């Protein structure tokens, strides 16, 4: 199977620079041009520019000359994406895709989970954890809700996965609220059984990659 | 350079009904291809050349041209097609990408199940109380929470956040949280959020006692 898996979320203070990472397998790497697409959270989708792995031939957004360096490396299959002088208008979403025509004339293309850079001159935070129990005041018609509140970090993003993924149905993730402080917090929320709280056990995995957070609480009645 | 315009911005359509997205184009382009995206996903090809299916794609999907004119159908409007849409165009070595269409489902009136959480021993030994009142699975969107402090209307210490549209029922869920230091948490009784929505034929209230 295709897969393009980018590297985690970043800060950078103004003035910085940034190289984000593609790793690509499940095909010749050599086979397919590499595109780099940013999405600022909330300008849509934009192209930076494309790589060609098999020559080294590269093709450039005007917009993005300047900002950005492209390169790869063969021997590990990965691509890379180099942004300099950092600066606030830079925040966003940075995806690699690889798509091209095969010779056949099928159209190829597949795309990475995303990196969100952040540029600020504020410092990384760690998120505070607190499970929010299954209890009388948390029951609807034989269902019980339950969750994690994920209180005060910096910068996005927070994931959130329940029983390592193995419980999906049911579970409500929350866009981030911004706190008067300029920290952030979310919820994540599941609803389940009331009859097998004492048989299963609710475990949300909470993931901050810009403070390297990573973060099991066991959720109980 | 090629500037193209996508329409609408924005449209809410009935389960099975016919969706038209156009992108209209300055100048006429080599290849038009056609993406979508649900929140917190990376895009999907759909329809690549105008008109060819991508690998996978249903049938209710297609494309067309006429000119500088191109046109996105869904012949038959699913709950899993919510999500935002756009035209991509490559012309002369430079892929362009339109302004986006949000395509939104309608669906029957369903009001919220509430649920409140109090505050677990591990807050209030933090310092701060953040008492959370859950709305699960309700439809249309607009919803109000009120929150009461013994029968006391607050205002200025509460957040709330609302889910995308689910793309299996078309509904939303919604959290607010009220934020009180520990100390003014042990100064009163009744914790209530009271919720207003169109399902609702008057406002529901889920409580609880502190200390119980």
């Known amino acids: 199977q295709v897969q393009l898996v980018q590297s985690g979320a970043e800060v950078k203070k103004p003035g910085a620079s940034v190289k984000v990472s593609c790793k690509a397998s499940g095909y010749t790497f050599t086979s397919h041009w590499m595109h780099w697409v940013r999405q600022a959270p909330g300008q849509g989708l934009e192209w930076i520019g494309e790589f060609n792995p098999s020559n080294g031939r590269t093709n450039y957004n005007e917009k993005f000359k300047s900002k950005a360096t492209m390169t790869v490396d063969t021997s590990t299959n990965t691509a890379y994406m180099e942004l300099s002088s950092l600066r606030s208008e830079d925040t966003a979403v940075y995806y690699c895709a690889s798509r091209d025509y095969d010779y056949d004339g099928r159209y190829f293309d597949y795309w990475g989970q995303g990196t969100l850079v952040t540029v600020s001159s504020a410092s990384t935070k760690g998120p505070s954890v607190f499970p929010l129990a299954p209890s009388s005041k948390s029951t609807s018609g034989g269902t019980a809700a339950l969750g994690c509140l994920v209180a005060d970090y910096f910068p996005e993003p927070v994931t959130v996965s329940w029983n390592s993924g193995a419980l999906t149905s049911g579970v409500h993730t929350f866009p981030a609220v911004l706190q008067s402080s300029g920290l952030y917090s979310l919820a994540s929320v599941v609803t389940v059984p009331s009859s097998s709280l004492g048989t299963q056990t609710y475990i949300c995995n909470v993931n901050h990659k810009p403070s390297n957070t990573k973060v099991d609480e066991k959720v109980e009645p | 350079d090629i500037q193209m315009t996508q329409s609408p911005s924005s449209l809410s359509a009935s389960v099975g009904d016919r969706v038209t997205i156009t992108c209209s184009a300055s100048?006429?382009?080599?290849?038009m291809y056609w993406y979508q995206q649900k929140p917190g996903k990376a895009p999907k090809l759909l329809i690549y050349?105008?008109?060819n299916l991508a690998s996978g794609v249903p049938s209710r999907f297609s494309g067309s041209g006429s000119g500088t004119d191109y046109t996105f159908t869904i012949s038959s409007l699913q709950p899993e097609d919510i999500a935002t849409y756009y035209c991509?165009?490559?012309?002369?070595?430079?892929?362009?990408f339109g302004q986006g269409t949000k395509v939104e489902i309608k669906r029957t009136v369903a009001a919220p199940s509430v649920f409140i959480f109090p505050p677990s021993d591990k807050q209030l030994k933090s310092g701060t109380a953040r008492v959370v009142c859950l709305l699960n699975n309700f439809y249309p969107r607009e919803a109000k929470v009120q929150w009461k402090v013994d029968n006391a209307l607050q205002s200025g210490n509460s957040q709330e956040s609302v889910t995308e549209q689910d793309s299996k029922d078309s509904t939303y869920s919604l959290i607010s949280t009220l934020t009180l230091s520990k100390a003014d948490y042990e100064k009163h009784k009744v914790y209530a959020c009271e919720v207003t929505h169109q399902g609702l034929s008057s406002p529901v209230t889920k409580s609880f006692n502190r200390g119980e």
């Open positions: 100048s006429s382009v080599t290849y």
């Open positions: 050349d105008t008109s």
């Open positions: 991509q165009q490559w012309s002369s070595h430079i892929f362009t």
